[PDB]
């Protein structure tokens, strides 16, 4: 069928461990989340311990909602793991945001492989605990996780130019250009001639062997050079999520499963909200509403987003491109009912029917009670 059905089946098929503590404890410091998270997680031999409820504490902070802190960790660690400065991952192309494995990871850090297994474990923990990583990989990355082949067309979404350059060779006789089975790459103020095959420097690309040339260039760009890195990642990820189980998703569903944003930007949420039946940005009640949303924690904000939209996952690009059951339906707050009534929501229209409460405190209790009722 569709995605929402698979996901339930998925979470359901995820075996809970009964030979493990009821929590996985982490004492971290934001200034060193990477090395702190790395040592703690890579310290445990049995990945099964990572299935336990995440109990994370930043800088000694205590009493905070576990889920809210976990959500922050997945955001903070993502920003570090996926920081190109470390040479583990890199941006797919100029002015592109998607992340790809840096083929030269071993030259930036000798410990890259274990860090790849680490990122894999974190990615796995994200999926297992129903959280998300902040960042998006190139499509071939997801395909490799599903163990799908990487063909020419896969190149288009990643390197439009390269794809076209190969398209030309595929549609023309390149013989006279005297191309050889090699490829140049510049790396740290140097150039490197790479053999696509044995004696590639000699073999000339013709009409009869250009098909083989294409295929090889694809593998060298996406698969071959990053072989050991992707394996380390998949080893870590599959320690939490069964490889066979995740095969039910395609590259697009898989991306949705593990990538996206956890909490919402209130300033963006606000700026793209529409008001009905007398309310406006400056209406006292609305000012109270946004003040309320402002002093809710991560967990509460999401529970509100879910109470009004039905879903708890934020649409990328912001609320400017929010969608309702039928067509783009902006987030709407409309005056309705009397202060005696609890707020009501129409998920289809992303609309909150908000009575004209007479104080901030009252608006807080009423709104919170309505949200808690449908829980």
């Amino acid at each position: 069928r569709d995605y929402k059905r698979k996901y339930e089946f998925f979470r359901r098929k995820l075996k809970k461990q009964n030979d493990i503590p009821n929590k996985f404890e982490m004492k971290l410091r934001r200034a060193t989340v990477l090395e702190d998270s790395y040592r703690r997680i890579m310290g445990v031999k049995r990945a099964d311990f990572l299935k336990a409820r995440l109990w994370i504490e930043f800088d000694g902070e205590k009493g905070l909602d576990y889920g809210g802190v976990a959500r922050e960790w997945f955001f903070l660690i993502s920003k570090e793991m996926f920081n190109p400065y470390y040479g583990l991952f890199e941006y797919s192309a100029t002015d592109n945001y998607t992340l790809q494995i840096n083929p030269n990871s071993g030259l930036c850090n000798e410990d890259h492989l274990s860090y790849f297994k680490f990122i894999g474990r974190v990615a796995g923990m994200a999926v297992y605990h129903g959280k998300l990583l902040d960042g998006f990989f190139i499509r071939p990355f997801y395909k490799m996780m599903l163990h799908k082949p990487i063909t020419l067309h896969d190149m288009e979404s990643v390197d439009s130019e390269y794809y076209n350059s190969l398209r030309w060779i595929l549609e023309n006789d390149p013989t006279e250009l005297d191309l050889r089975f090699i490829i140049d790459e510049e790396l740290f103020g140097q150039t490197h001639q790479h053999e696509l095959k044995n004696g590639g420097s000699e073999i000339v690309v013709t009409n009869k062997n250009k098909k083989e040339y294409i295929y090889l260039v694809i593998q060298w760009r996406f698969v071959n050079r990053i072989q050991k890195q992707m394996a380390a990642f998949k080893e870590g990820f599959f320690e939490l999520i069964p490889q066979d189980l995740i095969k039910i998703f395609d590259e697009n569903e898989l991306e949705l499963l593990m990538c996206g944003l956890g909490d919402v930007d209130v300033n963006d949420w606000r700026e793209h909200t529409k008001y009905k039946n007398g309310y406006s940005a400056n209406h006292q009640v609305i000012q109270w509403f946004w003040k309320a949303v402002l002093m809710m924690d991560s967990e509460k904000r999401i529970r509100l987003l879910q109470f009004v939209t039905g879903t708890s996952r934020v649409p990328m690009n912001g609320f400017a491109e929010l969608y309702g059951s039928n067509g783009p339906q902006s987030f709407t707050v409309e005056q309705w009912g009397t202060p005696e009534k609890l707020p009501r929501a129409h998920t289809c229209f992303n609309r909150l029917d908000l009575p004209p409460y007479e104080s901030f405190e009252e608006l807080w209790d009423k709104l919170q009670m309505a949200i808690e009722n449908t829980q």
Partner: protein, 76 residues
Amino acid sequence: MQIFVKTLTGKTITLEVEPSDTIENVKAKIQDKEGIPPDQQRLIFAGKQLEDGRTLSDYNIQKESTLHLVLRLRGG
């Protein structure tokens, strides 16, 4: 003289430094400009890592030349 330090994100930095400066110094100069603790910096010139002790002229680094910055993973 003027040298550059390209990062793995494509950002190019520009430093004002003397040929006598040690690699410890450039890492320091980089710290002030990009706010990065020098003990986390790896400098690459012509495919070679640069050691804190030696100077720029020890690696035959001259003006307009380009060094490469990589953040250090502490592994272990």
